[PDB]
């Protein structure tokens, strides 16, 4: 009898001692494009010495081209609509954005931010209802209220800022549709590997897509999250490529590497480890998933299967 099966670590932790405490600014708007900005159409780069992979390895490229995803870190209105249209260049589809941050964000007088608690766990333990629910109540009383805006600094704590009385509010919504973009949120918690529900969510949504649908991912800073479902969407469409052609290239295009490699971390960062092991395997099951059931074309959801198939450590 186990409390907590593989894969849904973070349910242990204590949502209580991660609340929200201050507007964290997702992106100062310096620059044209959002950070980690990559397609499945560009270019394979040299991997990162981090991850102690093979360079001189050239990856399978069959379905890059017709995958049709991006990703990126979070955005201001303006950096959204560049996005946008560097990618309608590439398809005549509709172009989604793909919001995976299930903390409450926004954008005020055009600045988008985010209810930080620590980890950036504020809306942690929360169910998808709850945390737009959470998201939609902050956003409004924010209206014609004096806030305090700040990027983190030292120790992840807020450093310098701004103070203004807020004069619009809009949600990620509604700034995607003004970029032209459609809009589906997921409600996934950072640094953690998405819950079934989460990947529920997606999978469903995934079903329903016209096949000329490009889908742009997105989180905070680009990285974990936005690897994750790339990743998942990469195995999804091209189920007849390898695991590691796929962690590979997924990587080599800019993203996170899901497969294992000597994670170092910080002791500050200490608490990251066990959550990094986690994805690395979950990852791998994930992989199981879909080879083992696209045959009946997914008849049984990934929660239910990731029950009677658990993960091992
Ligand atoms: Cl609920
Ligand atoms: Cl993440």
């Given at each position: 009898t186990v409390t907590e099966p593989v894969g849904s670590?973070?349910?242990?932790?204590?949502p209580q001692d991660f609340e929200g405490f201050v507007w964290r600014?997702?992106?100062?708007?310096?620059?044209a494009l959002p950070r980690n900005f990559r397609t499945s159409a560009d270019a394979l780069r040299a991997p990162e010495?981090?991850?102690?992979?093979?360079?001189?390895y050239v990856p399978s490229r069959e379905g890059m081209d017709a995958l049709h995803i991006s990703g990126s870190s979070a955005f201001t209105p303006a950096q959204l609509k560049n996005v946008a249209a560097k990618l309608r260049e590439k398809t005549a589809g509709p172009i989604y954005d793909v919001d995976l941050r299930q903390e409450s964000h926004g954008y005020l007088d055009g600045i988008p931010v985010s209810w930080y608690g620590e980890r950036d766990?504020?809306?942690?333990?929360?169910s998808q209802h709850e945390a737009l629910a959470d998201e939609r109540h902050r956003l409004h009383a924010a209206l014609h209220k004096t806030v305090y805006i700040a990027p983190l600094g030292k120790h992840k704590l807020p450093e310098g800022g701004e103070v203004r009385r807020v004069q619009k509010v809009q949600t990620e919504q509604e700034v995607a549709e003004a970029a032209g973009m459609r809009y589906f949120r997921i409600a996934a918690t950072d640094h953690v590997w998405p819950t079934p529900e989460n990947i529920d969510r997606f999978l469903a949504f995934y079903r329903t897509l016209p096949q000329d649908a490009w889908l742009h991912f997105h989180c905070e800073a680009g990285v974990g999250k936005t690897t994750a479902f790339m990743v998942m969407t990469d195995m999804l469409k091209?189920?007849?490529?390898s695991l590691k052609d796929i962690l590979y290239r997924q990587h080599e295009i800019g993203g996170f590497y899901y497969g294992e490699f000597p994670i170092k971390t910080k002791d500050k960062d200490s608490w990251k480890t066990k959550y990094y092991r986690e994805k690395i395997v979950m990852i791998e099951q994930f992989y199981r998933y879909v080879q083992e059931n696209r045959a009946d074309g997914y008849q049984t959801p990934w929660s239910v299967w990731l029950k009677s198939h658990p993960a091992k450590a």
């Open positions: 670590y973070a349910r242990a932790e204590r600014l997702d992106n100062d708007g310096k620059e010495k981090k991850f102690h992979l093979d360079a001189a766990w504020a809306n942690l333990g929360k091209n189920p007849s490529v």
